[PDB]
């Protein structure tokens, strides 16, 4: 019963920051590659941030190096995005998605959050 | 001996208490206004502004990998248990960020939502107590006896009800396991929630079982539209319809309860937070 929770999107201002949680459960957290997407209203679903290895600082999307990171928690199943220099143009649904090698490839989505940045 | 991000945690770590005062100061009333939902909001966001700053700085020590001395991480034990904090300094303080930054969205601010949905319930409702007065007049052939609109008064409660049976208690959006929605629904109260699927999730809803009792003793009394009542049946609806409404208050000052004491709660972790930040 794979799930992924999200939590902590919302208004923010131009500038501001965001941190955003997306707790896993339901499948082996370290077969997991966990990322970040975001989907603005009328463009196309893009990557944001990827990581694998805890230890790291993972990959990140251009549109967003240099103001996004990601992290990640083995022991509690999470991972964090850590929004800062926020625009206007980040405005979309953010949603993360864990691809589970496992025998098969899977790949689950949650239901996104929303960041709105604006005055 | 100062580091910009460390000068920065405290002080952001101090005004996130200064509004917690004000937000205590505000729970502290006897009545919530409108104007009380607007405040709170306020402070709320206040809170979280200053929240997603520290997690931003407690961020930077961690990616550079600031050290964290035995002593500052023998502070962090002083903890809240719902904070749920011999690993690196780059893990620890990584962790510190998730911590003040979940404890704000899935705890204190899951309070703050309840109190807002079941407030604007609350004062929906008594804006049907406002027109009360008027649903009530002398009847004709008694002196002691009233007439009551009836179907009015239940009209305005049936549109209260399909007002809010779209806005659930928690969670604010989207929806959740059931196993979720029950873990807040005994937090809150069985009796001020209730579990219900939204589409495949599940929500916990207002518990609008006073307005259904409002409604039953409403249909109880005879039929017609209007109702004629001698000063004795008057006396026993509006005893009943009463208590409904003080059952109704009493479930408000419960979640406000709730909602300030995790505000405490969150209040002790800052302060434990900023002590570790005074000896880093």
């Known amino acids: 019963q794979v799930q992924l929770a999200e939590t902590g999107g919302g208004l923010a201002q131009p500038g501001g920051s965001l941190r955003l949680s997306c707790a896993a459960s339901g499948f082996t957290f370290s077969r997991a590659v966990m990322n970040w997407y975001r989907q603005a209203p009328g463009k196309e679903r893009e990557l944001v941030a990827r990581?694998?290895?805890?230890?790291?600082?993972?990959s990140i999307a251009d549109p967003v190096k240099g103001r996004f990171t990601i992290s990640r928690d083995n022991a509690k199943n999470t991972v964090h995005l850590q929004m800062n220099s926020l625009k206007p143009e980040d405005t979309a649904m953010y949603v993360c998605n864990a691809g589970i090698f496992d025998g098969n490839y899977r790949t689950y989505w949650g239901q996104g959050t929303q960041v709105t940045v604006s005055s | 001996h100062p580091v910009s991000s460390l000068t920065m945690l405290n002080d952001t770590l101090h005004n996130i208490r200064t509004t917690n005062q004000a937000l205590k100061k505000e729970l502290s009333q006897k009545t919530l206004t409108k104007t009380s939902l607007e405040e709170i909001a306020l402070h709320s966001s206040q809170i979280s502004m200053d929240v997603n700053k520290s997690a931003q700085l407690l961020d930077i020590l961690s990616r550079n990998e600031y050290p964290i001395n035995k002593d500052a991480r023998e502070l962090l034990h002083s903890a809240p248990k719902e904070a749920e904090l011999m690993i690196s300094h780059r893990e620890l303080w990584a962790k510190i960020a998730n911590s003040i930054n979940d404890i704000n969205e899935q705890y204190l601010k899951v309070y703050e939502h309840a109190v807002s949905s079941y407030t604007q319930m609350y004062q929906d409702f008594s804006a049907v107590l406002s027109s009360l007065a008027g649903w009530i007049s002398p009847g004709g052939n008694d002196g002691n006896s009233v007439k009551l609109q009836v179907n009015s008064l239940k009209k305005a409660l049936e549109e209260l009800k399909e007002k809010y049976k779209d806005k659930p208690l928690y969670p604010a959006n989207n929806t959740v396991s059931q196993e979720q929605a029950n873990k807040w629904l005994t937090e809150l109260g069985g009796t001020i929630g209730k579990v219900s699927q939204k589409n495949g999730g599940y929500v916990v809803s207002i518990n609008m079982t006073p307005i259904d009792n409002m409604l039953k003793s409403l249909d109880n009394l005879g039929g017609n539209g209007e109702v004629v009542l001698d000063n004795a049946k008057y006396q026993a609806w509006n005893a009943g319809f009463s208590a409904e409404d003080e059952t109704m208050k009493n479930n408000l000052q419960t979640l406000v309860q709730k909602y300030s004491n995790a505000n405490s709660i969150f209040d002790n972790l800052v302060k434990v937070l900023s002590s570790t930040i005074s000896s880093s």
């Open positions: 990581i694998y290895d805890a230890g790291g600082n993972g």
